[PDB]
Amino acid sequence: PMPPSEFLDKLMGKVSGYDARIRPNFKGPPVNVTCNIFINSFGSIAETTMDYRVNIFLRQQWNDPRLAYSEYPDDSLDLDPSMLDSIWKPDLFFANEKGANFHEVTTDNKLLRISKNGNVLYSIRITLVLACPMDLKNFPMDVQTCIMQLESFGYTMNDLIFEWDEKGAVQVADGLTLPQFILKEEKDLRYCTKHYNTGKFTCIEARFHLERQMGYYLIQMYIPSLLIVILSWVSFWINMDAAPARVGLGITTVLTMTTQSSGSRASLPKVSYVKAIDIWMAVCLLFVFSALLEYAAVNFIARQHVEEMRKLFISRAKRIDTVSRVAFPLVFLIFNIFYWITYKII
Amino acid sequence: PMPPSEFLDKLMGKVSGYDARIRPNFKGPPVNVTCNIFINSFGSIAETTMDYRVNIFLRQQWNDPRLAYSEYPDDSLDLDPSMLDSIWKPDLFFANEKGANFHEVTTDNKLLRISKNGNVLYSIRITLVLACPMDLKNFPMDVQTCIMQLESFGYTMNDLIFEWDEKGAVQVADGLTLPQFILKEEKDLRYCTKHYNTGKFTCIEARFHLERQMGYYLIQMYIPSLLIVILSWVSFWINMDAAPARVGLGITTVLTMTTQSSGSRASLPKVSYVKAIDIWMAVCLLFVFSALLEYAAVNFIARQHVEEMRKLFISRAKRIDTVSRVAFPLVFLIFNIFYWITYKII
Amino acid sequence: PMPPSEFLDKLMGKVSGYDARIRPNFKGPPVNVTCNIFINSFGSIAETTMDYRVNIFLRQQWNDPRLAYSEYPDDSLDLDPSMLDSIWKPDLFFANEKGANFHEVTTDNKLLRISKNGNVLYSIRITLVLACPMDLKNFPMDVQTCIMQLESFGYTMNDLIFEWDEKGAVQVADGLTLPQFILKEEKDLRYCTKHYNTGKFTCIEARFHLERQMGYYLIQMYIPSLLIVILSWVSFWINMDAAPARVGLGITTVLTMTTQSSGSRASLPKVSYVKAIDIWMAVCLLFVFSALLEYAAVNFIARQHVEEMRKLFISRAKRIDTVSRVAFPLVFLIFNIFYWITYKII
Amino acid sequence: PMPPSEFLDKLMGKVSGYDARIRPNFKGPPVNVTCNIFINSFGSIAETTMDYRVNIFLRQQWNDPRLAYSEYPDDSLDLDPSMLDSIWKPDLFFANEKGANFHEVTTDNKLLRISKNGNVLYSIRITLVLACPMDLKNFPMDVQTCIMQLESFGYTMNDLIFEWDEKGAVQVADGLTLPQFILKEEKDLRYCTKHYNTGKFTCIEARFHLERQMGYYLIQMYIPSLLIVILSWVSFWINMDAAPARVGLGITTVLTMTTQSSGSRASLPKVSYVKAIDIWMAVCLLFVFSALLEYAAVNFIARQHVEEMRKLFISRAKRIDTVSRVAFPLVFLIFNIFYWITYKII
Amino acid sequence: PMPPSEFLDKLMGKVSGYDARIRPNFKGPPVNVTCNIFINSFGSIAETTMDYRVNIFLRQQWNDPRLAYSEYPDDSLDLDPSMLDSIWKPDLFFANEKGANFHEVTTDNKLLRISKNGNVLYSIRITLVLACPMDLKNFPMDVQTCIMQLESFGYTMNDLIFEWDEKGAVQVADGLTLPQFILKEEKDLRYCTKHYNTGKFTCIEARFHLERQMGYYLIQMYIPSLLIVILSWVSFWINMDAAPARVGLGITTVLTMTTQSSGSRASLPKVSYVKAIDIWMAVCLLFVFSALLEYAAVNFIARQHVEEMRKLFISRAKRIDTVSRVAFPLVFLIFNIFYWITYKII
């Protein structure tokens, strides 16, 4: 019962002629590689960049007859990771990496165990910054689907095939929550077989269904956008005398409404389509621009009105200042219903 | 008495058949690894990212019978760190690293000494950026508990076990203070034994109880939020004549109160729950929005009031402008008591 | 039928005297290297820096007679990438890299296959941050032409020549869209043969015609710039009595128009020439500065006007306040036509 | 007279049995290592992070009898830096590195020369980002003392000792100035002998006395803070009639004074103690808050004043508006004297 | 006619005893190294950091008799760059690197050719971030002189000397323009021979004369600073009645003039000396502060004026409001002439 590495000497070195430069079952059927990932860290979901950082354990399993062994008694030899640069390993890469890296802290974070019948279990900790093109049409109420797809790079489909094992292909750490999102529990697992001018390459991808939390965007942008609408209404309970007051009120509540429009996109890409948060800030910018025009009508109607005529327009001009107090606060409401219900069924 | 490395030649090389690729006490009980950390640098506690950077010395101790020696006279051979790539070392990693690194400046910052009975003392300087999910419910008065946990990655529980030595498992440099926090002196030391679809892996974690200093947030956000509330009150000692003054006063003190609401979260994650600093900026935004409505009542009540009737509402409208001077400054106070006492016992 | 690497032993090692340090067809005609790129990731088109990040697959093809083989039966031996540090490879570099890198995640992302007649197919995943000097004359309506050029660095033109293969020299991933641009489908392919004091070096470049999307810049800068122009007009339907109102209106709508001028260049280089977005913000800053002067004329003309004289200037001063309501809203329009048509045919 | 490296062959290789893995004078007295640094680049003194970047040449000198030589005629053999991975070198590290690095541009920036009697001169270019906890009590007038300390990491005090040579232990490049500071010329040199649970380790540190330049902070924060105080005074030469003017004046000069308070700390850590720049912005925020209350008294006193009574308070209310014009401008001055003299002797 | 590397075998390996660890002409005169650089990328001229990034080709030439060859027929053997780790190479470094790096994309970007008489031509692509202390006295009209200097680090002056070849020591790529600067065509080439406590080291530096483009700073800071001065003048064509208007006008045009003062230094170091852009923003801040005081005089002079007396000061107070309309607009102009002419001859 010699030590395992010396047993591994019989397994790896020039004895038996193991070559790590040639895939298993060479010249025969392709190599069936079953995969699955464990997720430690999920988050930093960027939107200026439209990517996100994950921290996974990538488990790979394939059979290699050359790694058979019956001398040793037990069923598994979880070796040292230094034995990992000498056996064959599939050239798995992430088709949307945007930068990734291993982890070498106190050891290469690597695992490797071999079953008697040649089954290999290979597992390494990885940090990825995967690209997912965000779809920001209905932005605060959107549901993103950021993917990650595992391709081969040098082996064609007839010489290396990936799969997902049918027992929980994607696990997640227990207490894993996101600050801005929630990660839905059903995770898709479909095929993405690529085709180039070089050949066809195996591919498999996992679809994570993110979904934004409404709390933050409800506190910083919607409510402050809404109070500024109400102050635009207090220009109606003021007489048609305070020219500086109402105009000063409206202008101050139309420029601050312009700042928050731009402020609602500081942390966003410069996309060219209008998004759900945009029509809110637009329509809220339309009401406030109306009250500054409503007083524009009053101050002009009253100034234009012999003595039986001037009061004749005071009633009309003052009729407006009472219609305004109900028109705006209710027209805004019915709009406020068609908006949220539009994004409660979309 | 040959030189130690040549003595180490007898200890390491092909003589005696030392293999660094196989753990001590192989096929027997697992390897008991006692740990403890020394902390040089603690800080850069991020909250947008919810991590923090530490600079530790990681000390590991385990027994290895193969490293026994009785030839040399003294009790310890603190070797060169180049002898560190040839002996066995536990594959300790940090389960929430988020990026780490060694230090190679003028030497690998590594220590290694071996006692006669085989005890190994292994110590290396590390920089870590550990992830700790912040809980920002009561934000300026919160108490975070950021952890660090030491797991194995390739050895299962029956073949490698970590522990904390029971003599000061976590030391700290003497004059170590944080700018924003204070690091409490009692540090937890519990177990975090993991379970995967691969097996069970040893784990141990240290719980550091951070606690925010109230000084900064008391100077930039609470007091400026409070002066703006008081200026909202000076719209009461002004007659019910200065329409531009009081409305200009209230509007200017309701928008600047909106900026500071958003300004109170520039360096924060976009969490979806309301936090303690939020109800302050909200309630302070409610008082100021009230004074702008209080004058909305006065200017409307006085404008609506034969000659025995107009003065009848001047008293009512002026009754308000005196009730306001005591109502707001005292209602705000009683709120100001239920707030701080709520976060002095929570 | 020995294994291929051992077949490759006959192909690479000291047998047959293959030297990777000497180009093919040595002392004869130069080495004809046909190229083409596949683009996975395109974007992060910076403008403060005037660069952009691409993620390509660089395919290279050249003949090497030394790599001939007739022993093996089939037509191609797609080897392991470890066989890539032993064969000759052209020293292709990117003449405007500004930083690049390979991808080592789970494998060097490399491909290598050899045809029987010696044809080499070499393909590697690369991330580039290529420099392209932006031309921002007509900025929101511009069309950039960012290049990428493949030069030799050590081999002169008579010893190594690059080319583009005449079957789709530049492919693109199917669903590849940009957030801010659209990538036109015709891609140029011309020569860029360099000359130094060392000699002449082969060079080939690809010209990508980017083109900005107008949606974002139409929403954040043009419309907000335009509403502020209209509020500058509401200072005309107000009587020549509200000195605080109209002046407060104009000043508030002339400073906020100054902020947006500077705000229209936060994410731009500090170029010294005037650009298309600049004349908009300038002319819009000229109208608003006019209305604040138009009231400057009214308040001065009315204040200067025995009793038959004061009304004589009221008509003139009030004649202005009606000419203004049509002059500005129509002069702005005709300008608004010469502007967009100027950038619809330029 | 064979070539020196072949002479060095007799000096380094298996001939003579030189081992680089064992310190000089082994088993005897410790190794006396005299040090000194030359500073090329000093600066980037961060305060959000409380560190700073230096670029030094670290010179080390120790004796090694094994490196004796009398064959060669001259006194010094400045070798190639490749000979630096074969001789012993002290494991000097920087106890507050916070990240450092060598320089490999066109060569490892390393020097190495050996005197006949065994004296070694070892010198390498380094970039450091050293941590120094700032003390920001009297911030714009402060004097920081950022240190750098050279410790051993694996050798205890009885086996390796550092020192500073007594001929200019710290030189500086000639034209080395800082943008924000000035580096005082006397530099401290004391001992910092550490103690751990492992043993006692040699340590030496250099104390650089930085001192801020007052020019910048005098131009951006003090003067603008002071003009805004004066405009708060121009609310006194205005009659007690312009309710919108004085209140608009005071409010506009009390909120802009709040912005600059927060603006005076954008580039600062979130420390919890009040600092010298804070009491300035506070007291300046107290004067401006007073003038807005001073008019609060006037408009209330005049509004409260049969016909012999109303003028009786006009004199009192107008008595205030003249006392204000001298009270504030002189009370501010005497404060302005106790402030600067307080930070001219502290 | 064996292959060149095998010819190079006779040139490099143990045959002939070539040692790369010993400089040419050893024990004799020093090694004369002629240099010159080609500049691809110039720019990213930082000012917060006072550095800049360049992308050069560094060509070095020296003679090495050991590399003589007469066997081969032609005049030059441009080898593979792998032959670059075996020949001697001067240890050139950049005395103000602040971080640099090679380029390894698809090959080490290296060139190496050897003439028959031993002349070596060595050329490598480099990216540098060189430090140049900016002199910002007359900031928008300044002319910086950022240097780059090539020193030895281990060889003293009597054993290695650098030079510039007298045929175009510094070339530049053809279409190389900067966004903010223009690179003057005459480039200095002088000596910078260093002296340390170790010895004297060869040094040579190149002086690039940068010069700012005035376009950007003329558009964002001077003109907006100037319009705000003119609006400060429109407080003069308004009667001495509009207390809220003129004071509101002046205050709004004195605070926005304070923001732009600070805004004129966001991207600048915190230098302690006053700079040319500072006196502009200061003097422009002095005019606007004057108009707010000019009305302070009017409203006080008119309010202080039996019936023959009140009109007596109306003329004096109104005499001011006409002197102002010519005093300020012309005093500002004459200042505006002494300013630009002062920076047209400095």
Ligand SMILES: *[C@@H]1O[C@H](CO)[C@@H](O[C@@H]2O[C@H](CO)[C@@H](O[C@@H]3O[C@H](CO)[C@@H](O)[C@H](O)[C@@H]3O)[C@H](O)[C@H]2NC(C)=O)[C@H](O)[C@H]1NC(C)=O
């Ligand atoms: C990797 O897995 C794939 C599919 O999971 C295997 O492909 C299939 O392999 C079988 C060999 O057992 C091939 O033989 C076929 O058998 C069926 C009866 O089961 C017979 O009716 C067919 O005529 C054929 O002979 C089968 O063609 C093949 N199918 C495909 C789509 O590839 C593959 O063999 C596995 N390879 C390894 C190395 O494990």
Ligand SMILES: *[C@@H]1O[C@H](CO)[C@@H](O[C@@H]2O[C@H](CO)[C@@H](O[C@@H]3O[C@H](CO)[C@@H](O)[C@H](O)[C@@H]3O)[C@H](O)[C@H]2NC(C)=O)[C@H](O)[C@H]1NC(C)=O
């Ligand atoms: C590492 O440490 C663990 C615990 O600190 C050791 O586990 C224990 O090891 C003993 C061997 O001395 C095992 O024997 C047990 O002894 C008790 C009497 O002390 C006896 O009553 C039991 O029936 C049993 O024979 C013990 O089972 C084991 N317990 C556990 C929970 O593991 C371990 O031996 C140490 N290994 C090394 C290599 O130091």
Ligand SMILES: *[C@@H]1O[C@H](CO)[C@@H](O[C@@H]2O[C@H](CO)[C@@H](O[C@@H]3O[C@H](CO)[C@@H](O)[C@H](O)[C@@H]3O)[C@H](O)[C@H]2NC(C)=O)[C@H](O)[C@H]1NC(C)=O
């Ligand atoms: C690489 O490709 C270039 C061009 O694609 C080849 O250049 C040409 O190579 C031919 C050899 O077949 C040279 O011979 C010429 O042939 C024509 C008839 O086709 C004859 O009229 C000429 O007098 C001459 O003999 C030709 O000069 C040469 N032209 C150029 C511009 O280089 C090159 O041979 C290819 N090299 C390899 C290694 O594939």
Ligand SMILES: *[C@@H]1O[C@H](CO)[C@@H](O[C@@H]2O[C@H](CO)[C@@H](O[C@@H]3O[C@H](CO)[C@@H](O)[C@H](O)[C@@H]3O)[C@H](O)[C@H]2NC(C)=O)[C@H](O)[C@H]1NC(C)=O
């Ligand atoms: C490194 O430097 C230290 C101090 O600079 C040296 O320590 C001293 O070394 C001397 C050996 O010459 C030791 O001997 C002492 O000599 C005095 C007379 O000078 C005698 O009165 C004492 O009784 C003792 O014998 C001395 O104890 C020792 N002192 C200390 C504090 O270490 C050291 O020898 C130097 N080592 C090397 C390798 O250069």
Ligand SMILES: *[C@@H]1O[C@H](CO)[C@@H](O[C@@H]2O[C@H](CO)[C@@H](O[C@@H]3O[C@H](CO)[C@@H](O)[C@H](O)[C@@H]3O)[C@H](O)[C@H]2NC(C)=O)[C@H](O)[C@H]1NC(C)=O
């Ligand atoms: C590297 O270049 C330097 C200068 O470019 C050379 O320095 C000079 O080298 C000459 C050898 O030819 C030395 O000899 C001198 O010759 C003059 C006549 O030309 C004679 O009048 C002097 O008395 C002396 O013998 C000369 O001293 C020396 N000068 C200096 C300042 O170094 C150097 O030789 C070159 N080295 C190599 C290896 O190319």
